[PDB]
Amino acid sequence: EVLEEIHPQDLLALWDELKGEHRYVVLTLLPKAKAAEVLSHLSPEEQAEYLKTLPPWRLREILEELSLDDLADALQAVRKEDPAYFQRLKDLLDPRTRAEVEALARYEEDEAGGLMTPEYVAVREGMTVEEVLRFLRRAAPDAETIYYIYVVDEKGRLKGVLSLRDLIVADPRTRVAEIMNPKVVYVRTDTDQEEVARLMADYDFTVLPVVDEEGRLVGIVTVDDVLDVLEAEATEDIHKLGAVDVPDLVYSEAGPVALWLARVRWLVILILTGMVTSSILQGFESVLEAVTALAFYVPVLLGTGGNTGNQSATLIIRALATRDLDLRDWRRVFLKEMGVGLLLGLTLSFLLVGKVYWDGHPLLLPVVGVSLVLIVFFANLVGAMLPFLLRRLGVDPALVSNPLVATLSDVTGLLIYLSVARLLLEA
Amino acid sequence: EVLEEIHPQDLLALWDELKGEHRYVVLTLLPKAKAAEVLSHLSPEEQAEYLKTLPPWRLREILEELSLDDLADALQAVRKEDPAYFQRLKDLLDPRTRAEVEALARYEEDEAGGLMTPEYVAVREGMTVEEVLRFLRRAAPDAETIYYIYVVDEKGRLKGVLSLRDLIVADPRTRVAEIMNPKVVYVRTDTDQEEVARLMADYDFTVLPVVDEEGRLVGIVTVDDVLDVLEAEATEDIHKLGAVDVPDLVYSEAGPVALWLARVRWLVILILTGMVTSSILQGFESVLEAVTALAFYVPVLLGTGGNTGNQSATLIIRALATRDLDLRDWRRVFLKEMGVGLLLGLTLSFLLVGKVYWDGHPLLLPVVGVSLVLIVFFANLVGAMLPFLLRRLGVDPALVSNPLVATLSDVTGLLIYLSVARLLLE
Ligand SMILES: Nc1ncnc2c1ncn2[C@@H]1O[C@H](COP(=O)(O)OP(=O)(O)OP(=O)(O)O)[C@@H](O)[C@H]1O
Ligand SMILES: Nc1ncnc2c1ncn2[C@@H]1O[C@H](COP(=O)(O)OP(=O)(O)OP(=O)(O)O)[C@@H](O)[C@H]1O
Ligand SMILES: [Mg+2]
Ligand SMILES: [Mg+2]
Ligand SMILES: [Mg+2]
Ligand SMILES: [Mg+2]
Ligand SMILES: [Mg+2]
Ligand SMILES: [Mg+2]
Ligand SMILES: [Mg+2]
Ligand SMILES: [Mg+2]
Ligand SMILES: [Mg+2]
Ligand SMILES: [Mg+2]
Ligand SMILES: [Mg+2]
Ligand SMILES: [Mg+2]
Ligand SMILES: [Mg+2]
């Protein structure tokens, strides 16, 4: 009845809200393909778990009816988790498929190769519209998408590319080279995952032709895998911008121990440079014993400075991820931001001073006030550069976390504030 | 002519590296397709700028050879900026085109109606595969995509969906409604772009069918525009993480004044949160004049709380926007982080007391160390649980920014520490 009706992703939606037993049952009963796609959009931890739990006949069925990219991904999860049983689970494949999948597992999960699938539709440059169409009816079962057609030489590498729409409008006796496009856009096996995401999103494509170290066409990447690549990447960016450092972390499926590792690393690294502020506070105990109101304005200056630093840092980190800004821009950016910080200072200060005056200390009112303008102005700029610096260093700018800049602006904040206190105390 | 072999992407790459005059003359001298695609992938502001500056004739060609969701958008930008040259410009638009543009501009640009095209191919079920391929070859020059054909009824409603592959592999004599799909997942007009993005990212689709209340087909949504939507929606989410609050900010073309605005609002909110920290010290001046090592150790605790809260806040906000956590999960989380917030404290404390002892103030380590465990733990929990609440109010929980969590950790941290100092000094 409904077994033929339902669409896997209804089962994918209800998956987060269903008991283990019945789940298992739903993997076993479905038509082969629908179970296969339901397993396809699952977590590698879960994937491994089920490829362990399920019967070897259904194992055969799923493994057989799973696109090669997604297969190799699954098998890879089982290699990392349980190596021996990965090999044993690999003993249930057929020769040609086992072989293609082995040649795919060798690619890197972050590179085109590990995004790519070898079931492209490839033709030689000397057929005709009609020939390619005949081939397309007879070759459409074993293909990921018959929508774009790649034209190759005698040896493997890209020559031309070809829209299905193009053939369908083309005069069936016309040869393909007369209607193909030789300026083919493509990635490499080693190309980083986000470079594919970028290229694909730039050119407004939906299949990108991975080539090998020699140029020979060896796979393709589809935009559908790229979207969850994108989401992966944006999520990594957000995560370490929050100074947590684990690339693939699912919050719902992780124990307090792992969270503790991931957070405690950078929490620690930052807490040390949090101690330097204590020892810096130690050596300025003469201007601090003398006037106490000084201490009554340390948090507000520090925290507001860190805030501003966050703002700039993030506002640039995106603009570098979004590829909106290049390294060579740094100089030009500097000035552009600088003025802003000035205006952010004055304004903020106008508030803080109106409170310093209201706190009842109209004496150090300009110590606080001027300090706040100086702190805003500098923290801001610190925020702007740190990414640029890391770029010329060859490091991920998203490592410039909001908390790192918070602690740094705490240090600079205190130095500015206390030296300004000292200098104005000499008056 | 050799200046006409180049791909518009290439030229868009060198756009940031070209002077205004130069920009204008390249955009004014290209092939219609090229010109209009180039202009199609720019920001609204120089979009509208060049729609204004360009010559009435070239703006007429560009306007024409432009796609219709894109024409809609560009017109909409000139519409935001300058209301008159909007209709003056679209007075160059032909009625068949213009009418469509009219019908598109009415929908809200962050909704599905706002990023849809009407150049889609729809065929009635009473065809045969033969007749539909006939229709495809004959209707292909004006379509956005002929890979998904949409079967409808006499009054216009949606009835089902065909892939061109299903046609191509089907025996041409076959009736259409035989190989079609009546279980066609669609998207409504008022729908949020973000939801659209979610759908198309789930189903591994590339087109989506837009509908009215009645269920009639009004247009389709492409994956490319949904993919720029995804990038936007994201980049907005993370700006919101840095207390910057403008929907689509582009830093490289925003002036010092605009950056100023954007930031000034929340930066101001947060400084008016700090004044409280000032007064909170001020009313504890009595307990604070006794010990100075006390004040020597404040930026460390406060900043640490701010950080822990920053981490938790981030994790949970991300897991919210990713739909990996539901509003009802919060209770679980309150426990989950709890222990963690404890574990992080102790460890960070074992090191902190390490200096409190070493820095020359063995006087009383607990007033600091304990205060660290409490502040780390508490800030952690707060940052962890502010997005939940902000989400249960029908507010974007990406508003729980890292400077906000920091500044709240400044306040709470301070109350924690100076109360612990009041008790352990007495
Ligand atoms: N990897 C690639 N490198 C270069 N060109 C490509 C690549 N992939 C696809 N193309 C090109 O993109 C187009 C894809 O055709 P498709 O019909 O999907 O485009 P369209 O926008 O629907 O219609 P039209 O091609 O008429 O604009 C083809 O013209 C083809 O030349
Ligand atoms: N909006 C939609 N709602 C429901 N189903 C759809 C929708 N759009 C497309 N489909 C279904 O998805 C399939 C898309 O066909 P297409 O050839 O593009 O897929 P493919 O992955 O290339 O190959 P295959 O269809 O053989 O898996 C079609 O069979 C179509 O019926
Ligand atoms: Mg990476
Ligand atoms: Mg892979
Ligand atoms: Mg694009
Ligand atoms: Mg386009
Ligand atoms: Mg795939
Ligand atoms: Mg990144
Ligand atoms: Mg701070
Ligand atoms: Mg479009
Ligand atoms: Mg929105
Ligand atoms: Mg729009
Ligand atoms: Mg998907
Ligand atoms: Mg798929
Ligand atoms: Mg959002």
Author numbering:
A (entry chain A): 23 to 449
B (entry chain B): 23 to 448
Publication passage describing the model:
MgtE is a widely distributed Mg2+ channel in both prokaryotes and eukaryotes. The bacterial MgtE channels are highly selective for Mg2+, and are involved in the maintenance of the intracellular Mg2+ concentration. The full-length structure in the presence of Mg2+ revealed that MgtE forms a homodimer, consisting of five transmembrane helices, one plug helix, and the cytosolic region composed of the N-terminal domain and the tandemly repeated CBS domains. A comparative analysis of the Mg2+-bound and Mg2+-free cytosolic domain structures, together with molecular dynamic simulations, revealed that Mg2+ binding to the cytosolic domain stabilizes the closed conformation of MgtE, suggesting a Mg2+ homeostasis mechanism in which the MgtE cytosolic domain acts as a Mg2+ sensor to regulate the Mg2+ influx.
To gain further insights into the ATP-dependent modulation of the channel gating in MgtE, we determined the crystal structure of the full-length MgtE in complex with ATP at 3.6 Å resolution. The overall structure represents the closed conformation of the channel, and is essentially identical to the previously reported full-length structure, with a root mean squared deviation (RMSD) value of 0.38 Å for all Cα atoms. The electron density for Mg2+ corresponds to the Mg2+-binding sites (Mg1–Mg7) in the previously reported full-length structure. Consistent with the previous structure, the electron density for Mg7 is relatively weak, possibly indicating the weak affinity of the Mg7 site for Mg2+. We also determine the crystal structures of the full-length and the cytosolic domain of MgtE in complex with ATP, which reveal that ATP is recognized by the CBS domain of MgtE. The ATP molecule is exclusively recognized by the CBS domain. Accordingly, while ATP can bind to MgtE to modulate the channel gating, MgtE either lacks or has very low ATPase activity. This conclusion is also supported by the crystal structures of the MgtE–ATP complex, where the γ-phosphate group of ATP is clearly observed.
